[PDB]
Amino acid sequence: MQIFVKTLTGKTITLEVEPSDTIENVKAKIQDKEGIPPDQQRLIFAGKQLEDGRTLSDYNIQKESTLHLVLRLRGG
Amino acid sequence: MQIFVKTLTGKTITLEVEPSDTIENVKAKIQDKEGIPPDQQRLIFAGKQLEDGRTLSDYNIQKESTLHLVLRLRGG
Predict the structure, then answer these.
(1) Which of B9, B47, B76 sits opposite A70 (nearest CB)?
(2) By the CB < 8 Å criterion, does B68 face chain A?
(3) What is the DSSP letter of B61?
(4) B12 phi and psi, to 5 degrees?
(5) B4: distance to nearest CA of chain A, Å?
(6) Which of A61, A72, B16, B31 is least surrounded by CB atoms within 10 angstroms?
(7) Mutate which: B5, B36, B42, vs A, most A CBs within 10 A
(8) How many CA atoms lie within 13 A of A42 on its CB side?
(9) Does domain A1-76 fall into CATH 1.20.1250.20?
């Protein structure tokens, strides 16, 4: 299923995630494409932060959904 | 100087911070006001998270600047 991860920096990411795909694997996809380190990725939804060990369907995340991405660069 | 702390959900907090203030200290000041624990305070600037150990002027944060605040809850 397609999803749209938009960051406040002004960048959107389009990935084909799976219903039972863990948040951890979602970050992995971004890492594969944009090359953004999953450990530096902060997926925010509804105003809170998502848990790496959780699934998309855990937060009612479906197709065409929008996830907020924040770059957490450590030491800078 | 005063800055604007706006959450991703909907809230605008205003406090007095120094140019050489630290992100960690900023969260501490917000805790003295809104009572929100600094551990749950996520400072966002242009889609990038603010390093807790960095300074406001290091991020080019001046007076009357608006920052985003995200609540980091466990499990979301």
Answers:
(1) B47
(2) yes
(3) -
(4) -130, 110
(5) 17
(6) B16
(7) B42
(8) 22
(9) no
Both structure tokens of B52: 């807790």
Give the residue from A9, A22, A26, A44 with the most B CB atoms within 10 Å of its CB, the best one to mutate. A44
**With an 8 Å Cβ cutoff, are B51 and A9 in contact?**
no
Determination technique used: NMR
What is the distance between the alpha carbons of residues B65 and A59, in angstroms, rounded to a whole number?
32
Q: What are phi and psi of B29, to 5 degrees?
A: -65, -40
**Are B56 and B21 a contacting pair, CB within 8 Å?**
yes
- Name every chain A residue with its beta carbon within 8 A of the beta carbon of B74: 51
DSSP string for A33-47: HT---GGGEEEEEBT
Count of beta carbons in the 10 Å neighbourhood of residue A27:
22
CB count within 10 Å of CB A66 equals 12
Q: How many residues does chain B have?
A: 76
